[PDB]
Design a protein around this ligand. Structure first.
Ligand SMILES: Nc1ncnc2c1ncn2[C@@H]1O[C@H](COP(=O)(O)OP(=O)(O)NP(=O)(O)O)[C@@H](O)[C@H]1O
Ligand SMILES: [Cl-]
Length: 322
């Protein structure tokens, strides 16, 4: 009976929450780091006492870098969704100068830098992470959301060693097909490259690419020039390292299926063809969803400038919906 997850997403999708907090409600502790459009600040919600990561997006910068649609889309998705492996948007508001995304404070690590530092993951460790992505894509797809941007860079490891998807700029809600050429070359599904339309099956392609990259330490398709990567994706084969189990190679043959009508995740049994695959025979799907499996990696956990908000409104039109 999770037609309630759909019903609730749809209320929030149809009437997105706006100005759910304001700046004067947060104590500013310190700057955590710098983003594309401004700082992320550790803040204490004055009422509750909880700490959050407040991302400050300068509207003028977002316009200048032509990231308007992506910013709006990301916020709109994040205020509608609810799933254990999606970063939690706690509050959003705007003022004359900035957009504010008040995120759950997650003192974790980055999948990208953990993968690159370790070199590669064991199949059982790759499988632990992959199962979180499988359940996430099941959720997103049941809401007609195509993520279409999977890659380690988009995944952080929280304090329990579980995944959170951190970026929804590219994700599109759409019932059938869409055409936008977007993503990063190594993770492009062939039906995206061939420019005749694609659907949610491109996420299962990208899962294949991620599992391979986790298990090998490098992705299946790579080259000095993007056109060489596109050639490989479209009409190349894949080469599995000899260390890959036959279970893993069989799963990847069916995820990195160049023909989307035969790709696992896109057939009559849908997500069950992936969940019921041999490689995932040891995965307790319910237990992964409940974060009851012990994770293999637990992350370890002066120059302060004020925020100036203009008295004049900037980019009112561009960010009306926010
Ligand atoms: N939820 C969070 N919890 C804790 N620290 C965070 C959180 N979100 C962002 N940060 C910190 O803020 C820094 C910059 O924000 P970040 O979200 O990385 O920016 P971005 O604009 O999304 N670009 P990118 O660095 O490529 O992801 C990060 O390197 C973290 O140190
Ligand atoms: Cl591209």
């Amino acid at each position: 009976f999770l037609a309630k997850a759909k019903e609730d997403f749809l209320k929030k999708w149809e009437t997105p929450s706006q100005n759910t907090a304001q700046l004067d409600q947060f104590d500013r502790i310190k700057t955590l780091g710098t983003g594309s459009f401004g700082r992320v600040m550790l803040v204490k919600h004055k009422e509750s006492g909880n700490h959050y990561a407040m991302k400050i997006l300068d509207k003028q910068k977002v316009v200048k870098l032509k990231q308007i649609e992506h910013t709006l889309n990301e916020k709109r998705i994040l205020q509608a969704v609810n799933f254990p492996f999606l970063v939690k948007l706690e509050f959003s508001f705007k003022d004359n100068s900035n957009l504010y995304m008040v995120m759950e404070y997650v003192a974790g690590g980055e999948m990208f830098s953990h993968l690159r530092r370790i070199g590669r993951f064991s199949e059982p460790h790759a499988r632990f992470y992959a199962a979180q992505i499988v359940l996430t894509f099941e959720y997103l797809h049941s809401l007609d959301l195509i993520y279409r941007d999977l890659k380690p860079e988009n995944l952080l490891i929280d304090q329990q060693g579980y995944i959170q998807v951190t970026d929804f700029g590219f994700a599109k809600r759409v019932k059938g097909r869409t055409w936008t050429l977007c993503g990063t070359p190594e993770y492009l599904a062939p039906e995206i490259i061939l420019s005749k339309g694609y659907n949610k099956a491109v996420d299962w392609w990208a899962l294949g690419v991620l599992i391979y990259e986790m298990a090998a330490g490098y992705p299946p398709f790579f080259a000095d020039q993007p056109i060489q990567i596109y050639e490989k994706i479209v009409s190349g084969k894949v080469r599995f390292p000899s260390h890959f189990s036959s279970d893993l190679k069989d799963l990847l043959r069916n995820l990195l299926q160049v023909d989307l009508t035969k790709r696992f995740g896109n057939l009559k049994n849908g997500v069950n063809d992936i969940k019921n695959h041999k490689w995932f025979a040891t995965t307790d799907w319910i237990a992964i969803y409940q974060r009851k499996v012990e994770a293999p990696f637990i992350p370890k956990f002066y120059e302060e400038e004020e925020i100036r908000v203009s008295i004049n409104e900037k980019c009112g039109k561009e960010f009306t919906e926010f």
